[PDB]
């Protein structure tokens, strides 16, 4: 064959996953990996191109991110404009790309069957894009509302301006995103048509080199080989270089400086940061993996341990940063106390004094050992990954390793390299270092501001005095290196499967204490299970008061135990600790060898625990800001925010919650911690690779702790409440508004009120909203352009149900609301043009999503998870609900429309969420009846019913 | 209701469409369509039988065929023999039906009003059909007169001889149409009585479970439902099961055989046939469908661009054919240049060359796609059909769809089966065909003569060595797939409806070279335009040299534009073109988007055409043959052809075009175009949606353009002759005779000029045609059994007209002249008797059938196109000489009766064409006097005087 270069030869693959493959380099250039598994529900591919950002013209910002977006909106071969989303939305597919500084990358998945519809239209992005005139013009505001999205957050600003001062010659300094300036404003004046740019950009770039493609579907290696070649081999090769940046953006001058930032969070952080080579090429060995794990340790002896004793920090990360190719950067990066923001200086001493350590100490194999026997274990057992996110992760990589080595490259290394790792070492100097300070105590002390995003700051050299300083860093013997780690597990035995093992979930223990639901894995053979506890008591959220003691207790709890947890994360073994409205959930996941001692000591310290009058005052302040920096979180984030706060029979507000801290004492948490464990009930779900004796030991282990320490009784049957949702009444509009201070975009949330869950009402709502999937998208966002963020779907909350629809947007939420009215229109009418195989597309499209299989142990435990924390115990709902789907008719879907859904239905509940910026031919839209306004959250929910609450099976 | 078994809601259709549709299915079994459409000014209603000739008994052919004629003649409930046919002429009505190998079909059109009159007795054509004895024994000789007609016609004895080569044992050999002897004679001798047969047939087959009705009229789909009912509801469910043909008539045996073939006219065809499986059952992705449009394209690339270029062949027809439920086929057939008659077997080897093309790429999804596409637009902005024609289809196919999926079934593919595309392909191979070749070269040369036509034939086998240099046919470089189609309509906007707007076509250009009539479409929005124009220059038609030039000059266009306009039709934008006796004449059709781009072209190659040497010559000699083979066609086509000739004042015969054509000559038609476009006058109408100055601009781009490109100056007033008819004295009869060389059977016009036409002098004739329409019909075939083609009506040529009598018949001229004289006097008493209830009737009738609304635009188009190339203008007609109508009495009749056209008017202008064949109580007929006989028509026109010419209204 003449169409391919190279058959690579085995790829090397965890001696557990049966999926099969291979490698190929076209005769063009391309890299192919090729994934066959006869298992799979869905199909997918991936195709990266090696150019991004960093290749922009300076003369026109963001144009690959903005290209980007153009190849998905027609080609020669299929002019439509939304052919590409519509195909695979009838045939259960999503898409997606994203644009890095070097990479877009560009995925999708589809219903087995469909690899093929899929891959033509798909190969067609890289042949012939039309950059169609008109739909230039309107997409070019999508971007634009990406960018909004974004000047307000302030990791995207910290990104920028990390970009603004360093060598502003260097293209590490361009803006990536762009926006309407950038893409349209600025090239008209300068008189530049921009579709010709696109395809110039295109030609010049989308070179066949340069390009990397994997495909996984049941398909022999064989057959999708055939298909790779057919598709991609006339994908022109125009011998592109690959672009180098040998030169780092942090020259010398930019080396020994000091910025202090304003942030838009009250957040107070400091930013430590180091330039180093590329070092990619060394993936063998690793010397920033091997430092960056011990910076970044958080065991004993660490430096965040000594960081946190101070009371300075709460919280560390270092390692390894990726710039482009030629250039890095490490990081040590700190959250910061009020005291720790007025001691940075002796904090970054400390830092410069745990580097003098690892210099004294020298390079550790045993450190490398435990390491590479870490990642060889994790490379074995590592969990099946959705299709989607696999071809697109492996396209990336394949520009990187070799054929053969694409699976193994980044888990497995090889080489002990004391050189390397004292080479690294040696650029982690005071000369050679930049911080950053973020605080708001810098309000009004700034002389500068940032081009793109508006960010504030001021810029110092670091006085030399203070260089020499933490160039004389002493050894402190506070710092010492981590221990052995004990949690590395060593026990991998599968158990056999069990005479009575079930194929769900089965009661095993139904006491007065205790519900607990187990099952052995049955299908996935890895050495891992997961523990679900909820525990219920009515004290967790009785009053906003017991709401702030009940997150503050486990807050304290888990930094409490972070030191003696963090071995065990590292060995793969983690733990999930959070307050609900109805008490705790407590997870446990991983190699199931030492999941008993963690938990065990996670219970022995919930019912023991002391807490640290210093730690509790710390953490106090930090969740005082938290509630207040909501204040900042995104206007369709507040929209879903009021809603639930409307809609739930009781849920405290932020402003509730924030006042009720300052009442929070010291020994009333003392008080609050007995007198929450006193009484509980616990609900649990024990699945993986364990006996049901084993269940049952550690079910009552956890009880009996529990017991011992804290004289834990049952809770009455009676106690074990749910929330309810409000009812809305027939042909009733509620509107809720309100202003977000800081973005200057509104948001919308709709909710159209169906009725209770039930099989019949869950499937007329789920039909509806795949059917209205795409359109909406397609009508709202790529034809109206009304914002970036355009959601519709089901919404699930209290046993109710309903359909909803989020925007985030510059126009105004009354205008909005006639826009999403005017597309409910088109889609009756659609609905009823539509001829009976496109209904039936539908049908099995959501049949397909709805019966795609669990990849791996988490993914089935969420689905159990889910049927258990709702109550509703429904484990073969999917096989039920698709069998009673397959029934409806076109008929069925119009009549349930015309009886909720339409504008004059009898029984339409509509309730929208307004809210407004931070200062305030198409379809026809129908008259809309005068709304009532919601004043008051209590009254609302007072003056209607309430819905029952949905009965188990 | 228990009459009805099921009642679905919903037939899926067209956005544009006003109409409403209710699917039935009654408790008999009859599934049933209504159309409510509050508007037209005709209902109508078709029944579909599934049972057709194919179902004939063995010893009695054209059974089914003979009934159908049968149940029009008498019933029960109505037993006078035309009160059918009677009860819709007074009524505005018309009937028919066909007979088809497995339907049976009846549908009639009625003035709305008389819905319930009309389709009860229509509905008893299926419960109590007479068979009247005498009926019988009449209406055989219309049956016999019908095959007879056909003896001659090289379509149908091809179409029997394709049946007479494959199994002699399946029903598919079966003579279909039956005649004299097969329904009579043979019969009578073998003891059969045939009206018995016809009643066993009927009762055995006529059964509710296998017939289809479809009733459209004014009424609600509630009042349309219960009337159905009423006259349906008691049809006999016989339970008949439906036949089923799945053993292929075409065995091994039958497959690889050459057929050669004598023509009666001169023709030189090919035809390749490949026996294939019943495709029906995959309507929705039709595979057929796909590989009839790749192999029956004819843009570049194509086989038959290929097959054109060697001067082989001129036209291409490939694609699925039908045969019956269990068999199809597919065929590929080309007409053949003197060359290709001697090169059949390397054209063979060039169709299967391009079906291994195409077995070498695989099933091509975007041109799968873009036919899906194509039909969805097609069917989105769809012509409204008239109601006769529409019932009558879809109660054909309300055989094959469920209710709700007949509107769009025929019109739209769905899902992409590259599977069955590559299973049907597959049968097209050399084991698996037939070939035939039609051609003069084989009169003597055959060996085999067909029972029923008569057709000459020979059979071989095709050796096995032919066979297997087809099977190796390898690829060649002339054939590639379609590219793109870049006439696809994108912009389907309807321009607002302008203040300036008329009700009629207004003049909005009157130059001396350019008279621009122009309507923008004020009733039905769709996004298309009708585009007319005559270019007149004396050059056209000056002598029969001139004609013949003019001819294949636009005939060399067309072929050289045909590449290009292919992919414009494909895409519902269509032209056509031909040279008239003034000028020639251009239209443009279809969606507007496009059209100036194609018009455009058409204009440029018109002005700027370099002929090519071979296109001519071959183009040349199928015009020469074309010309002669006038001699084949029908004794009263001959008729009518010479009374033209003899009416109309310069007229070129076929004679003398044919000698003339010799000295037509590359050098001479490269001379005469230039000659021919120099001087020109333009009068079109632009019609549709389109806008005033949008009008001025196309008629300015098609003069600019000729100006351009051939000096194009205007011509002078007085040179802008239309011609004038022949003035016929009083009492004058005068008789012109000739015979049919082909056909056994004599054909005749009779003309009885009256005056120019004139409001008066049109409705007095229109009224008496009237009139004497049914009873025409009635006398002199259904009681006399004359022929089977029996016409009258009103003439009109060059502003005069007059009445027309149209026979072909076994009996001599001489004597059908008498018999429509002897039926002149008993519609004389008919009228004198008529009551005056009966005589409004008729008004009402002529009243509803002029005023009838158009339903297309072209329908619209063609009338206004009527009044402007008569140059009468007189574009609100209808109603002016409607309202004229109503003034009319009995006795104005009477006196335009016995003035104009009775036997011994002081005014009578009768004019006889006599044709006579290959070898040539009652009421009474009146005395005639010697005519005076034609015997040179030059001489004849040049003793008369000319008419005037009407007056530009
Ligand atoms: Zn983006
Ligand atoms: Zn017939």
Redesign the interface.
């Known amino acids: 064959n003449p169409a391919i270069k190279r058959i690579g030869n085995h790829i090397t693959k965890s001696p557990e996953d049966k999926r099969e493959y291979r490698g190929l380099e076209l005769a063009n250039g391309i890299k192919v990996l090729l994934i066959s598994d006869p298992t799979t529900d869905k199909s997918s591919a991936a195709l990266d191109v090696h150019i991004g950002s960093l290749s922009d013209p300076p003369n026109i910002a963001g144009l690959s991110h903005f290209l980007q977006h153009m190849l998905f909106l027609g080609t ?5 404009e939304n ?1 590409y989303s519509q195909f695979l939305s009838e045939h259960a597919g999503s898409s997606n790309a994203f644009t890095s500084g070097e990479h877009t990358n560009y995925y999708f998945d589809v219903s087995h069957e469909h690899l ?2 899929a891959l ?1 239209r798909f190969a067609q992005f890289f042949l012939s894009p039309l950059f169609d005139e008109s739909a230039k013009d309107r997409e070019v505001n999508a971007v634009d509302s990406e960018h909004e999205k974004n000047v307000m957050n302030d990791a995207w600003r910290l990104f920028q301006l990390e970009k603004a001062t360093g060598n502003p010659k260097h293209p590490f300094s361009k803006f990536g995103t762009g926006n309407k300036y950038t893409l349209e404003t600025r090239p008209n004046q300068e008189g530049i048509d921009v579709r010709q740019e696109l395809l110039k950009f295109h030609s010049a770039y989308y070179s066949s080199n340069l390009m990397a493609v994997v495909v996984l579907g049941r398909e022999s290696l064989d057959d999708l080989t055939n298909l790779v070649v ?1 598709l991609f081999s006339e994908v022109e090769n125009k011998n592109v270089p690959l672009p180098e940046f040998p030169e780092h953006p942090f020259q010398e001058e930019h080396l020994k400086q000091l910025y202090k930032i304003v942030p838009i969070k009250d957040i107070r952080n400091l930013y430590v940061t180091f330039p180093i080579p590329d070092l990619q090429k060394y993936y063998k060995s690793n010397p920033g993996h091997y430092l960056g794990h011990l910076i970044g340790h958080e065991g004993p002896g660490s430096l965040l341990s000594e960081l946190k004793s101070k009371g300075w920090v709460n919280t560390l990360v270092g390692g390894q940063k990726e710039g482009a190719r030629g250039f890095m950067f490490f990081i040590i990066n700190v959250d910061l106390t009020e005291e720790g923001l007025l001691h940075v200086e002796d904090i970054i001493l400390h830092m410069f004094q745990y580097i003098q350590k690892l210099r004294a100490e020298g390079p550790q194999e045993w450190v490398f050992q435990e390491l590479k026997d870490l990642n060889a274990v994790a490379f074995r057992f590592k969990d099946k990954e959705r299709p989607r996110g696999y071809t697109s992760k492996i396209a990336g990589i394949l520009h990187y390793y070799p054929l053969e080595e694409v699976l193994t490259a980044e888990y497995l290394l090889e080489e002990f390299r004391p050189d390397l790792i004292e080479m690294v070492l040696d650029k982690l100097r005071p000369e050679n270092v930049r911080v950053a300070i973020v605080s708001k105590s810098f309000e009004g002390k700034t002389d500068r501001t940032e081009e793109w995003y508006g960010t504030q700051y001021k810029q110092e050299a670091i006085p030399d005095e203070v260089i020499k300083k933490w160039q004389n860093a002493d050894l402190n013997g506070k710092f010492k290196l981590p221990t052995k780690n004990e949690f590395i597990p060593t026990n991998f035995e599968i158990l056999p499967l069990e005479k009575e093992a079930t194929p769900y979930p089965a009661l095993i223990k139904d006491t007065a204490m205790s519900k607990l639901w187990f099952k052995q894995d049955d299908k996935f053979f890895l050495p891992k299970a997961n523990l679900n506890f909820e525990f219920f008591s009515p004290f967790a959220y009785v009053d906003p008061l017991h709401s702030n003691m009940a997150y503050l207790y486990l807050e304290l709890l888990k930094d409490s135990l972070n030191e003696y947890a963090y071995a065990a994360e590292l060995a793969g073994l983690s733990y999930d600790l959070q307050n609900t409205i109805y008490g705790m959930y407590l997870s446990v996941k991983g190699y199931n060898d030492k999941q008993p001692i963690l938990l065990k000591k996670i219970i022995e310290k919930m019912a023991t625990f002391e807490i640290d009058e210093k730690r509790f005052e710390i953490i106090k302040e930090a969740y005082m800001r938290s509630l207040n920096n909501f204040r900042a979180e995104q206007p369709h984030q507040h929209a879903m925010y009021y809603l639930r706060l409307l809609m739930t029979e009781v849920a405290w507000t932020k402003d509730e919650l924030k006042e009720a801290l300052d009442d929070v004492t010291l020994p009333r948490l003392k008080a609050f911690i007995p007198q929450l464990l006193s009484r509980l009930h616990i609900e649990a779900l024990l699945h993986g690779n364990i006996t049901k004796q084993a269940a049952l030991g550690i079910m009552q282990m956890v009880e009996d702790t529990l017991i011992e320490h804290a004289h834990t009784k049952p809770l009455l049957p009676s106690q074990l409440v749910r929330y309810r949702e409000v009812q809305l009444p027939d042909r009733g509009w509620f509107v809720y508004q309100q202003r977000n201070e800081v973005h200057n975009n509104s948001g919308i949330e709709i909710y159209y009120q169906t009725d209770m869950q039930s099989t019949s009402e869950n499937m007329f709502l789920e039909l509806f909203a795949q059917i209205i999937s795409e359109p909406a998208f397609n009508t709202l966002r790529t034809k109206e352009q009304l914002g970036y963020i355009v959601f519709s779907g089901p919404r699930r909350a209290n046993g109710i149900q309903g359909l909803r629809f989020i925007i985030q947007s510059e126009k105004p939420p009354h205008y909005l609301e006639s826009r999403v009215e005017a597309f409910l229109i088109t889609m009756e ?1 659609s609905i ?7 209904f039936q597309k539908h049908i099995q499209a959501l049949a397909i999503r709805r019966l795609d299989k669990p990849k791996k142990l988490s993914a089935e435990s969420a689905k159990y998870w889910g049927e258990i924390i709702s109550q509703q115990y429904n484990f073969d709902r999917d096989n039920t609900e698709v069998a009673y789907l397959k029934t409806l008719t ?2 069925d879907i ?1 009549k349930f429309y015309k009886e909720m859904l339409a504008v004059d239905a009898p029984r339409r509940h509509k309730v929208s969420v307004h809210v407004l910026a931070r200062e305030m031919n198409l379809s026809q839209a129908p008259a809309l009846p005068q709304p009532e306004v919601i004043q008051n959250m209590t009254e609302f929910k007072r003056g209607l019913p309430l819905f029952p609450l949905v009965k188990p099976h």
């Open positions: 020669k071969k299929y002019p439509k052919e093929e519809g033509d057919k009418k009823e043009d539509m001829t009976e195989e496109a076109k008929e119009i």
